[PDB]
Design an enzyme around this catalytic site. Sequence first.
Site, short mmCIF file in Angstrom:
data_model
loop_
_atom_site.label_atom_id
_atom_site.label_comp_id
_atom_site.label_asym_id
_atom_site.label_seq_id
_atom_site.Cartn_x
_atom_site.Cartn_y
_atom_site.Cartn_z
N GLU A 81 0.84 -1.22 0.00
CA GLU A 81 0.00 0.00 0.00
C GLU A 81 0.87 1.26 0.00
O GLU A 81 0.88 1.92 1.05
CB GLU A 81 -0.99 -0.05 1.16
CG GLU A 81 -2.17 -0.97 0.91
CD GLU A 81 -3.19 -0.42 -0.06
OE1 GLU A 81 -2.98 0.70 -0.57
OE2 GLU A 81 -4.20 -1.11 -0.31
N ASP A 82 1.52 1.59 -1.12
CA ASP A 82 2.31 2.85 -1.26
C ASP A 82 3.73 2.73 -0.71
O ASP A 82 4.43 3.74 -0.73
CB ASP A 82 1.57 4.09 -0.75
CG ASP A 82 0.17 4.24 -1.31
OD1 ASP A 82 -0.11 3.60 -2.35
OD2 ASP A 82 -0.63 4.98 -0.71
N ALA A 83 4.16 1.55 -0.28
CA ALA A 83 5.55 1.36 0.19
C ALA A 83 6.54 1.36 -0.97
O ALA A 83 6.11 1.08 -2.11
CB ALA A 83 5.65 0.13 1.03
N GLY A 142 5.25 7.71 -0.71
CA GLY A 142 5.42 6.36 -0.14
C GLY A 142 6.41 6.35 0.99
O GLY A 142 7.37 7.13 0.95
N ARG A 157 -4.83 5.72 -9.37
CA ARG A 157 -4.38 7.14 -9.36
C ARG A 157 -4.49 7.76 -10.76
O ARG A 157 -4.64 8.99 -10.83
CB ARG A 157 -2.96 7.24 -8.79
CG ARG A 157 -2.90 7.36 -7.28
CD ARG A 157 -3.25 6.10 -6.52
NE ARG A 157 -2.84 6.23 -5.13
CZ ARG A 157 -1.60 6.09 -4.70
NH1 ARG A 157 -0.63 5.80 -5.55
NH2 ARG A 157 -1.32 6.24 -3.41
#
Lengths: 58, 58, 46, 65, 1095, 245, 405
Positions: free
Chosen positions: E730-732, E868, E900
């Site tokens: 999740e966005d890492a 991130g 996005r």
Amino acid sequence: VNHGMSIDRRHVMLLSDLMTYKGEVLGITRFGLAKMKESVLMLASFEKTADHLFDAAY
Amino acid sequence: QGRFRGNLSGKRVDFSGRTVISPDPNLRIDEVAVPVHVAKILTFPEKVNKANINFLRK
Amino acid sequence: QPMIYICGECHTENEIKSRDPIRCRECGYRIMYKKRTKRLVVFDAR
Amino acid sequence: MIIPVRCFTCGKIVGNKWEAYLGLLQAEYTEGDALDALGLKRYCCRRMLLAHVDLIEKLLNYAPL
Amino acid sequence: VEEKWRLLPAFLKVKGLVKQHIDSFNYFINVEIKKIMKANEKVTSDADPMWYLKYLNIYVGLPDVEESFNVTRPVSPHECRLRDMTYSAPITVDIEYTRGSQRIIRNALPIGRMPIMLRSSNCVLTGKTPAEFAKLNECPLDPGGYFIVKGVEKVILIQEQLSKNRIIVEADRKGAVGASVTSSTHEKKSRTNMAVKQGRFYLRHNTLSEDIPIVIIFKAMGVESDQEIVQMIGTEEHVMAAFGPSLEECQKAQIFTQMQALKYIGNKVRRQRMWGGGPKKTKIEEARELLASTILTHVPVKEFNFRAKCIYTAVMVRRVILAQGDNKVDDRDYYGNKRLELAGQLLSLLFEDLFKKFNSEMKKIADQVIPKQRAAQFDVVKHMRQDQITNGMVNAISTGNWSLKRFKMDRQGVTQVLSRLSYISALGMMTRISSQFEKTRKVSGPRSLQPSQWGMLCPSDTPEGEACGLVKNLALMTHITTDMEDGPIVKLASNLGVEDVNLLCGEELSYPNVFLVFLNGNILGVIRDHKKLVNTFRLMRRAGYINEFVSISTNLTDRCVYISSDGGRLCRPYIIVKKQKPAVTNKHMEELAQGYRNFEDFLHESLVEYLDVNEENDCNIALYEHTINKDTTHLEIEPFTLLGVCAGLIPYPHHNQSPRNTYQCAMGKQAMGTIGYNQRNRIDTLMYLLAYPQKPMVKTKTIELIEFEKLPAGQNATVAVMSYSGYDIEDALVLNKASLDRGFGRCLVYKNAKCTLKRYTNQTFDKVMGPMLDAATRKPIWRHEILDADGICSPGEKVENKQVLVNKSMPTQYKDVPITYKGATDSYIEKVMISSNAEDAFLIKMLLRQTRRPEIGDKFSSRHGQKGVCGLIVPQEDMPFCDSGICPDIIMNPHGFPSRMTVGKLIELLAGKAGVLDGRFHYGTAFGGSKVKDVCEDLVRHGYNYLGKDYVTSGITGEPLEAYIYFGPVYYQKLKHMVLDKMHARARGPRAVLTRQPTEGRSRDGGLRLGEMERDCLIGYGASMLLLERLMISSDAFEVDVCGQCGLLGYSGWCHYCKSSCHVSSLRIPYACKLLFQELQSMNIIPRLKLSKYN
Amino acid sequence: IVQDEILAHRLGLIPIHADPRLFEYRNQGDEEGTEIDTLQFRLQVRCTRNPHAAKDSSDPNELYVNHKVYTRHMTWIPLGNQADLFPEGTIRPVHDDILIAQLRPGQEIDLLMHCVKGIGKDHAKFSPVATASYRLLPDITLLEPVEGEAAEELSRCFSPGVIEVQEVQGKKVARVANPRLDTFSREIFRNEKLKKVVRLARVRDHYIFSVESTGVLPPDVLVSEAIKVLMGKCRRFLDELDAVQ
Amino acid sequence: QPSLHKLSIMAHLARVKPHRTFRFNECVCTPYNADFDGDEMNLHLPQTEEAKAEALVLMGTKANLVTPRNGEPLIAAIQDFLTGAYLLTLKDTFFDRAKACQIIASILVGKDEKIKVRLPPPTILKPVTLWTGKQIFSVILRPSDDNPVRANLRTKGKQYCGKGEDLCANDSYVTIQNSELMSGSMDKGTLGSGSKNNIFYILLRDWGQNEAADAMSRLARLAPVYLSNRGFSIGIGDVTPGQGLLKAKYELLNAGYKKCDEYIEALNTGKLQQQPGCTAEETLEALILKELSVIRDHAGSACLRELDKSNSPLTMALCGSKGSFINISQMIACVGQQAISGSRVPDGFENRSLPHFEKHSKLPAAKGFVANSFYSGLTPTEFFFHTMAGREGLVDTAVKTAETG
RNA sequence: GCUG
Ligand SMILES: [Mg+2]
Ligand SMILES: [Zn+2]
Ligand SMILES: [Zn+2]
């Protein structure tokens, strides 16, 4: 169900049945809490903390 | 900020920590990895009870 | 243990004793910077 | 502030090339051709010289001296 | 006209960007101050009629600070930041007071010190070459427009208000359409309203206790006769009929003459001042004073003649009635009706109040001492105090509170501290606009994006959170206007055929052909031909006979033509198209670049024009030359200027979903990068500096104009977009260890510790004492290791937690009060500066340097609104490698792009990869930029796939990956938030004295708040014990003694009330409840407690 | 002006020409070190104005002496018998031109550096190769004979020397001459007609290995050392199995 | 901290690790509504044995794998876990013994070290010996021969052709017999949150909380190892419109534009028919809005047809890992009419949305219809209209959070 | 004021 957002009826079967069990439909506002609850600090922890504490001292 | 909401319904609490959260796919769903620094500050009180006596002394 | 301070503009070493106004000779500057420590400092290159 | 000594990804020494690159640009050499003369074939190494902003010279103007 | 772009740099050299702040203060220091002094010129004493104190000329001098009794030396902006002084200049005024009996004229008397904004005309920095800046220790690329007050740089944010002098038709809560014109003059600013509360028209004002029926106001003004009032308002059946109920109200009362209405209004005027007012002002006279300076003040009575006030009042009444019918209320969201006020206006209002307070205080002193103290002459110059004016402004700038009671102005948040997180953060803060309505939580109001904002306010730059639309940012090419004289516009209009309004009975205003002319809100007459006044006025402005910023606009629905030279109005430059052909003509565009012409020459040659939002409503702008039609009137100079400073930095903004662009604008401000060339010299509270900053591979035209490349804030990183490890969900982000080791992301955090040693009136002064040696060691104790002999620490030495930076002793005799470092990690002292503040007090400032490498939990953003945290740091060997041997510095998950919809990031990798190989910097400017087709051809020449997908092999397994992986260079900016500073843990620690609960701040050892929502979830879980342990035992558990008979708490097994210990019993209660029971008992609410044994 | 922490990091990155096999790994702690485990280098540079200088002095180099600190300035301080074992100039920074820092008149850098043996896993400063990579050998095969103007486009689709067009009968024909040069841009797929006439494949068991050293030791020696390190890892585990049984 | 339902506080067992950051498994992030874009979370340590037991028995993650609102599972596979599984369980995924053994090997850690792995007999056996991905996924459900779980599911997958229950063309009907996937590919429906047709839900309901949690931990190990080695990436080529879409969009755009023109003349010169509830200037807007919607829908259908069975954006949409077909259509074909409050952009200037269009223009594109795709780029007027619609959503979320609290 |  109009907004997607599925929900059990058993939750709404509880919220309606609380809202109309003391005679008339008691909407969950600041005012409907006074006609639902007897205890002061549960009303006093909600809105109108000044009046609900003085009136229950009267 | 008043006493009823600020200091009674919700209270500042000891034995707590806040850090940024990062991913770990290698952890079971029931586990959280805690930094060794926070682990050293946060403590749990354990009474000597005849089964933890050897472990506690070490 | 003399205390010597270097001014911001003139860059001339000035000796100021305790309870002496921080003005620097050769200029009118009132900002003075303490000199670097003589002690050896160790830094890990990592 | 100052040219990085080693390329961040590949690890090639790019500290030696900064002075030569500036000189080649002072001559008619194009930026792509100047990088080619230095020998920076891979894109990772080329960006380090191409994208570097030399602030050490500007910062030093305000240094004590 | 390929070089139509060249006009944006040229308009920008003189105006635009941060100039809108600078040119505004310049008008206040050079023109407005003298207008305010003429308005409050002359102070007269009640005790002596002869005494008079006029002001002749006011000047504001160069900024100087005197550190001695009479030195008066010049000062520099950097020294004031370092010594926590205020950068300000003296305000010197010329007066001719009465003195003993003469008319003594004094030239140059100081009345106080004025704060000076940097880069202003009076500022030392103006006109200085870059070499000269180095001696002054000021960065050449500094925006300016900020004030150094008490060592903190403060910016006054621009405020958007509804325009003054203009009637606003607006519905009340009841749905009752009313009207309200705020009259702003140089003497009195007041609000006059009109209301239909019972179907009949009442005028309201703050000086009148009750609402006055309008017909009585008309009769007092002098339009006696019902027909003249009806003729003025309307002659249409509907307008007359609706004003019919209002006629009866005066008829029912007996008012039928001016005197009988003036007296009625007087019996209602609030007469608040009954003391020190002497005897005067009869009720009729007080009314003739109000109707002539208080009601609709912008319209001016010539010699007590209201002919002008009465017509204006009729126009307001007609506008309410037409609106009441169709309910067409004016929009208060249209930017035409809203004027932005920048520093000059805010400072002028603050000065106006302080000058009137200084004048009043001098009259009060004169009235008290002139008639009583002595025959010896009263000289005002001796009693005049510099402090009232100086202290007033400084405090308003230092604390953002605009409390001016005279104008009923009570606004806080006017000024903020300039943000030095990055160069972009500072430039953005200068172009920042604050809304008027700030408590609005309705989505479709100020918070919405209004089409009127086009070209004036950046569409995508807004904070996300409590102020989604409340805070707005100016676009690149925008000029906020300043007030002009108006002598020429009044003359051109009369000669242009505008008949006076005094020479006509009101019937004309309702004919369909007659139209009314309004200048800055005052009627200049009635013209039959609207188009000739509008097309002649524009032709005159183009030749330069009339000022460029004066705007002529016409509303057909309400027959009025509005000419505005007011100031505070947003204006944008546009090319003029006449007969389907743009006027630039190519040759002129080359001349600008060569040097023959500047932007001003284009404006007066009729090539370019400035159009405000009202003027734009009458124009048909075409964005591009190809879109030109027959109806098109103007052409836009450059499309990309629509976006603002933060929005521009994003490559290919048009190719992304709009929410993503908004996030980038906020993130760019939070990035860590170079601040200035003087960054090393500055000693700010917090400075974050990237160790090795790099210019962006895909640049934009805005980056070049802002000079972002000269001081950049980020590093270009080779990124492979692929799914790797699963530690990037999740966005890492996954980062290679070797790049972090080689220097990628390395940052320096500088913090400032400040100590001041003060001298008391007792003559006892704090002292710094030297390190206390332990003799046996012949070495200082561990806590005092770093201190040098003087007692202040030495530059270049590591400081650990709990070490003492300065050994300071304060006289109670001396009790040590040391400044001790409290950092979870060691820092190295870089610079220790010793100086004296405005009152000499030995200020000592230390800069502590800590270097932090990127670590798991650090935040990195991509310049496309995708932020991130670093999920995993992997060794170089495990990272996938392409044939060339390039391994990715950062691996980014492919899953982020589909939801996005950031196509722009994908284009930026391709453009950057092509650019690095070519040696060229590609442009991703908005509405333009490098096309994908051209970039792909460059990759093919260099041996790479056109789409940029590369064949890679896996480092972990050594075998090729099945899918081709997109690999390219993209600029990544490290954000200020770092896990090291955000990690807090508290066990047993300091508890606040008042409630015995834990502290609220990490710095104070904190303690986390289990709030009501967390408490509710625990009630749902059904865990009774967990709630008791968390909210009583681990927060504030306590024992109280309660009596059985009374029910009142006691102490030590006794009750001072029913003095019998026998019934006292112990109870366990949260200690907070004990405070509530005590506060209840003190306030007379007795919380009596019944105690029952557990069973 | 350069911060000491930044200056320390830059010095760690600079490569040393000392041969690693001669030295031994320093034990944990043991900061003082020994002749066998460490090398000491001292850098002392002070920047001074040039006494004889031109009036304009626009160029810093004419105006100042020692304006730039370069790796040539670093001087080896021999410890114990190291001086005899290593002849003068054997132990030196490899590049000789890397710019450590830039100074202005009156500014001085004085420092001592200790060099220790390390592996790349601990830090990238210890890695001996700028890049080590392997690519499988390309084996382009034309499924159908290609002749005519098609040969010119097929030659353009691939890398510069891989495809050579020969006029066998005065008619252009395409042959694959040097498949090793192919960079696999895969631009043939863009052309619809040629996509079906060629097959792009890599021989799985033929690997072309490219090693670029940082100059610390000769590239042939580095590859030999790597094979020996793998042999060592297997031996360490075999020894453990002997102990267990 | 922004706690909105019961699942925002959850207990967790605590295992100390060197890195500073509270790291949890990413399956449990939708109960927290927690992305990793800089978020911080709070830890509380119960200080009593009675409080510790109540937290483990009642607030533990294993006991709270289902929402109380509907009973649907909330702890379930997300993103890359979902895509690795869809890609592993596709009909084309075939594996040799070594590749099978390595992928299955990831499962043997954290209490799986003491289980002897059962390798199922290979699906292909004579020209070459090969297993299938569906066979390797099935080891997650029953890793060893002494595991007692025999999970059964028979459900339509998303993409179901509507006919042939298990012989669908798209391979989108899932059958799991005795913990062995016999058909179908795993998608958000069978492995993700919100469905009672999930395998993890059948495992919770029929075999217990422990068996479900063990399987979810095994997927979080197997799915990442396959995807990292296989390679999944997006690029510009994935979002680039092809020739079929390009020719079709031109025809669809012209047809819709001319039909809109016809209605606009019908409102003005002639007479426009009115719906019984609707009125003039409302019938035209509503009917034009439907036609503009048709253009975007038809352009989207062409874009999906041209896309290859290998586009990273399509694969994520075909499973439910990230994205939708509206998102892909907007990027590759045409973004639609920007709607503010369900209606075309209102007129900020008098009788005109912007000064760049004629007054009283009801034409599409003067009222917020953006013909261009995100890939082609938005023209300046189109960009402003899209920003206006986007801000309405951003303002709504901020205001809504305060009201719900 | 900003992050969450
Ligand atoms: Mg978040
Ligand atoms: Zn000096
Ligand atoms: Zn008692």
